[PDB]
């Protein structure tokens with residue numbers, strides 16, 4: 001099976017390529033031109049290591065600059081992870097790249113997929129499409145994003161439904177909830193907080209720290225994502241939440257990190273940022289039914305891994 | 316009160332400005348870049364006519380290349396109608412302008428409105444956000460557009476909710492259902508079919524012509540749109556359908572045009588355009604309560620008004 005992974009040099013993409021290549025039957029093409037919040041210097045190593053594998057090819061190009069007819073001619077499955085992420089940096093003059101890379105890129109990929117017969121077009125979306133909801137959110141809820149980021153990701157899901165209904169492109173949408181672990185982007189909370197804790201710097205907390213997320217450990221995320229390819233169930237046209245084992249507040253996380261580090265952290269409480277919900281909580285029942293998804297990694301185990309990864313990164 | 320109308324030179328915008336200027340208390344600023352499917356030479360007359368009114372100011376500029384802080388200084392109400400419209404031409408490479416002018420324009424306007432103190436930001440959207448549903452559609456239905464055009468308009472709606480919830484911009488979203496009448500854009504069904512009938516050319520039907528729309532006459536649309544400004548009810552944050560007096564198929568409309576013209580139509584049946592619903596039908600319960608909205612113009616009357624306009628235009 002030949003698989004295209006867009007955004008292959010990113011946090012999730014690099015882990016996904018590594019996981020797919022463990023199956024000797026899979027061939028993977030990664031495309032990435034090293035934009036968004038993570039500097040390229042943190043991405044090249046993982047790509048060089050994947051390129052040692054005879055079943056991996058990398059294309060360092062913008063999807064919008066690429067001949068997508070050439071790229072897709074021998075592709076069975078597309079994992080579409082390329083995007084500009086980041087709820088908090090999607091305002092004002094920063095918005096245009098979210099539209100170009102989250103909407104125009106998705107449209108161009110789907111147009112190119114009209115001219116081939118994919119098995120699956122697996123589109124990665126976000127809990128950010130939901131906005132503020134009470135209770136565990138299921139995939140049938142009316143989504144009302146709270147951020148410009150969330151809006152652009154929701155437009156990407158809508159484009160998938162347009163091309164599925166009109167042209168039978170075999171879309172599947174995965175909505176990830178706050179993924180963490182080794183290689184987590186440097187703009188994300190855990191990466192920042194652990195880095196600050198290791199440096200004996202005040203921990204930057206947006207608002208009062210009581211906000212909660214359905215944090216998804218990267219290995220859980222990737223097992224669900226691979227299950228979207230490998231399931232025997234017909235999942236075409238389905239939106240599927242991929243969420244974590246354990247929901248927690250930012251204050252809860254900081255306590256767990258203090259127990260792991262033996263540090264006593266100073267807190268710097270900053271003004272809450274527009275665009276962010278107080279709570280995310282996935283109903284992952286549909287993923288259980290369709291993918292046999294069940295997250296297995298506890299926050300203490302996942303935070304141990306990320307702590308060791310960050311400690312080594314800044315050593 | 317000073318009102319900014321974006322897309323003021325367009326089909327709906329020019330009628331809105333005309334309606335607002337009838338109120339001696341209202342001052343109107345129109346902004347329009349003369350783009351989208353209607354040639355500039357069909358639009359410049361409406362601007363010169365509105366410009367006879369001392370209380371109307373016209374700005375011929377791209378909203379994306381305008382000093383918006385200066386445009387919005389003295390503005391109390393925004394009516395945002397500027398967009399690239401049209402389901403059928405939103406596919407392939409033609410998508411790009413829909414993204415710029417339906418999503419980036421909306422974001423840039425809302426960003427400019429953050430710290431000024433508007434009374435209302437009245438954002439115009441479309442039935443195209445719904446896609447295929449049976450029966451009359453209400454505004455609480457989960458919208459899954461069928462066309463890329465529909466996606467871009469729903470993205471603009473979602474930006475309005477983002478700016479409303481985070482910055483208290485007082486948004487109201489109106490969802491229009493297939494508007495027609497005098498000054499209807501030349502790419503829309505009635506304008507094309509009338510012009511063809513007048514020219515004794517074959518009438519282009521996409522599909523078999525049994526598709527129906529909730530056709531909204533321009534004066535009904537505008538009464539609802541002005542009601543969004545003038546209602547005494549709190550409608551901030553609401554999404555409101557604006558629909559028409561009666562639904563009809565394209566084959567029904569062709570029959571009415573044959574009767575108006577006294578000519579027999581040669582029908583040119585072309586392939587269906589992807590991205591179009593078979594039926595549109597607004598539930599206008601919410602507009603009835605919040606805007607006292609009731610469409611009054613019969614399809615017969617409205618189609619005759621459009622037919623006379625097209626005949627005089629050409």
Ligand SMILES: NC(=O)c1ccc[n+]([C@@H]2O[C@H](COP(=O)([O-])OP(=O)(O)OC[C@H]3O[C@@H](n4cnc5c(N)ncnc54)[C@H](O)[C@@H]3O)[C@@H](O)[C@H]2O)c1
Pocket residue numbers: 006007008009010011012013031032033034035036037038061062063064080081082083084085101105124125126127153175176177178179180185
């Ligand atoms: N990290 C999370 O917690 C999280 C949660 C929900 C959803 N997601 C989604 O998961 C995906 C991956 O997120 P991530 O955290 O790995 O982000 P990332 O920034 O690490 O990875 C995305 C990659 O996409 C690439 N990219 C962007 N636009 C491109 C273009 N035009 N052409 C080619 N490459 C392009 C970037 O260079 C980047 O390496 C994104 O779609 C994001 O919206 C992530």
Ligand SMILES: NC(=O)c1ccc[n+]([C@@H]2O[C@H](COP(=O)([O-])OP(=O)(O)OC[C@H]3O[C@@H](n4cnc5c(N)ncnc54)[C@H](O)[C@@H]3O)[C@@H](O)[C@H]2O)c1
Pocket residue numbers: 321322323324325326327328346347348349350351352353358376377378379395396397398399400416420439440441442468490491492493494495500
């Ligand atoms: N005609 C319909 O049936 C209908 C129904 C539902 C929704 N709508 C919506 O109503 C609005 C008006 O549609 P219309 O039929 O009057 O279209 P129109 O094309 O006649 O008018 C839109 C106007 O916006 C202007 N404009 C576009 N982008 C601009 C930019 N960047 N800066 C400045 N001006 C810009 C255009 O020049 C044009 O004159 C649109 O938002 C459309 O999506 C129309």
Ligand SMILES: O=C(O)[C@H]1O[C@H](OP(=O)(O)OP(=O)(O)OC[C@H]2O[C@@H](n3ccc(=O)[nH]c3=O)[C@H](O)[C@@H]2O)[C@H](O)[C@@H](O)[C@H]1O
Pocket residue numbers: 085086087088126127128176177178179187188189190192193204205206207209211213250273276280
């Ligand atoms: O970008 C993305 O791909 C993701 O954006 C959303 O994730 P987020 O919640 O933003 O992740 P994360 O950066 O870990 O912030 C967690 C919390 O810590 C707070 N936070 C953050 C940083 C910091 O220094 N301090 C702090 O308190 C911060 O204010 C927030 O309350 C979606 O939920 C996710 O599905 C995906 O779209």
Ligand SMILES: O=C(O)[C@H]1O[C@H](OP(=O)(O)OP(=O)(O)OC[C@H]2O[C@@H](n3ccc(=O)[nH]c3=O)[C@H](O)[C@@H]2O)[C@H](O)[C@@H](O)[C@H]1O
Pocket residue numbers: 400401402441442443491492493494502503504505507508519520521522524526528565588591595
């Ligand atoms: O862009 C817009 O602003 C509008 O897009 C949508 O309107 P529509 O229904 O597309 O309008 P309209 O051009 O009158 O086509 C009517 C029918 O005639 C058919 N049609 C059209 C032309 C022709 O020559 N022949 C024909 O059969 C055509 O295939 C279709 O079945 C939204 O509903 C509207 O709210 C608004 O957003």
